[PDB]
Design a protein around this ligand. Structure first.
Ligand SMILES: [Zn+2]
Length: 485
């Protein structure tokens, strides 16, 4: 039957925690309540002294992405296995359409690659890296028929993915027309371009040049510029990988001011900092290189966790885009050629629990919100996921909040041969992972088949995202002053 009864644990949802068993049948949670009967044949997972939580949803992955001419080593198969071993049961990955390339073709190419490989459920965002009538039509089709309500735009990567303010305005207007959320990579691409060209001319070729060429003012600027353009068209906006206190503060201010904007710090920016770029060992330093960079102010990850706790920032991904040591080494003489990207998919849940909950910054319920529920709300499949409740999908993690585990490339399940959280002792261990109603990780071991996970098709106009937008369309229309002719 695939029947499971999770007994003896404490259920933790975004709103409150309560003791109850959870009955899973055929991919679904079919009952939640105290002292449930064990149906004959059902497997019991004993969750005594464990929390029973929705599996983590990683909003931000790049599994096997061909990026700076090379291709990330964690692929859809190993990347999703690694996510499951870390208590994460869904990933949302970016279709990185090339400039001038059909968005539908790129989407089709991602689905063909991921469908036969994923070990957990997944969905997709689609990058809008150029603009034209064809792109406009394809975005409508994706939103209405292909299950995608999130488009990603770049203010960085001049020459490559970058769009100018007038194009962002049109792109954000059309996101709003098709009921999608606009995601932005917010750094000033012109400043990055000049910055790196300047660091190199000064002989600063190492990873410190990568951070110095685009300090956090560059991120904070483009963050405010994206918010202002999105506010001008009444388009909801999502700022991916918030890396710095100053860009986080921009997002915090815009929300207090009522702007429909969501900020996403990533496990990296929550669990480590950019002082690593100044490490004497070049290889160590290079491991941390990604855009935007981690910041050398050591108060940054603690500060981003505070804003995440307070909902100035709302939910988390990893930007998992991994390159091996020999791959990073492609930039040994020039930081502009180090493939950009860090790990996280596996460790996100423990890193956040240790840095956010064990530290006293947020409670276990807020932890659920910022690791699964808010992603399900924004991308439009709550309470199908992100909630332990009857009729929800059975993606469930039995969590031990008191035990610690040390993160190490020597013990992790990612394909990458290092870990930016190397050595970190985290409270918060995923002891059992359930995905689509099957036990896929227990006693330290994975049991899953590539292609077992499914693409999740979403509808447009997520209510969490759009209900205020639509009301503002109805009452916030500018009016003419009536004057004598
Ligand atoms: Zn990314």
């Amino acid at each position: 039957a695939g029947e499971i009864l999770i007994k003896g644990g404490k259920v933790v949802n975004e709103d409150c925690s309560f003791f109850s068993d959870v009955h899973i049948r055929g991919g679904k949670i079919v009952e939640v309540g105290p002292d449930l009967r064990v149906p004959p044949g059902a497997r019991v997972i004993d969750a005594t002294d464990r929390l029973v939580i929705p599996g983590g949803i990683d909003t931000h992955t790049h599994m096997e992405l061909a990026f700076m001419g090379t291709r990330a080593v964690d692929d859809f198969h190993i990347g999703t296995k690694a996510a499951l071993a870390g208590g994460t049961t869904m990933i949302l990955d970016f279709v990185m359409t090339q400039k001038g390339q059909s968005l539908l073709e790129a989407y089709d190419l991602w689905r063909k690659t991921a469908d036969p490989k994923v070990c957990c459920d997944y969905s997709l965002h689609v990058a809008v890296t150029w603009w034209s009538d064809e792109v406009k039509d394809e975005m409508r089709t994706l939103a209405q028929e292909r299950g995608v309500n999130s488009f990603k735009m770049f203010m960085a990567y001049k020459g490559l993915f970058m769009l100018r303010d007038d194009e962002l305005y049109a792109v954000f207007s059309h996101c709003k027309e098709v009921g999608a959320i606009a995601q932005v990579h917010a750094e000033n691409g012109d400043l990055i371009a000049e910055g790196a060209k300047k660091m190199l001319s000064l002989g600063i070729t190492g990873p410190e040049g990568h951070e110095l060429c685009r300090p956090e003012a560059v991120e904070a600027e483009a963050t405010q510029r994206a918010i202002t353009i999105a506010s001008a068209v009444n388009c909801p906006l999502y700022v991916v990988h918030v890396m710095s206190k100053s860009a986080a503060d921009v997002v915090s201010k815009a929300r207090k001011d009522g702007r429909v904007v969501f900020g996403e710090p990533i496990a990296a920016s929550l669990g480590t900092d950019g002082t690593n770029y100044w490490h004497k060992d070049w290889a160590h330093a290079a491991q941390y290189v990604m855009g935007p960079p981690l910041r050398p102010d050591p108060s940054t990850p603690g500060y981003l966790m505070d804003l995440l706790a307070n909902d100035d920032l709302t939910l988390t991904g990893t930007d998992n885009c991994t390159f091996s040591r020999c791959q990073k080494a492609l930039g040994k003489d020039d930081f502009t050629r180090i493939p950009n990207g860090v790990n996280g998919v596996e460790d996100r849940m423990s890193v956040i629990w240790e840095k956010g909950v064990h530290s006293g910054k947020m409670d276990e319920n807020r932890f659920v919100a910022v690791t699964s529920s808010n992603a399900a709300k924004i991308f439009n499949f709550y309470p199908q996921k992100g909630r332990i409740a009857k009729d929800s999908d059975a993606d469930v993690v039995i969590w031990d909040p008191k035990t610690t585990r040390k993160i190490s490339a020597q013990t992790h399940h990612q394909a990458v041969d290092y870990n930016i959280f190397e050595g970190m002792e985290c409270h918060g261990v995923p002891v059992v992972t359930v995905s689509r109603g099957r036990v896929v990780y227990e006693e330290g071991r994975l049991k899953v088949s590539p292609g077992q996970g499914r693409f999740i098709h979403r509808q447009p106009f997520s209510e969490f995202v759009y209900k205020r937008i639509r009301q503002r369309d109805e009452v916030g229309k500018p009016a003419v002053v009536i004057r004598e002719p």
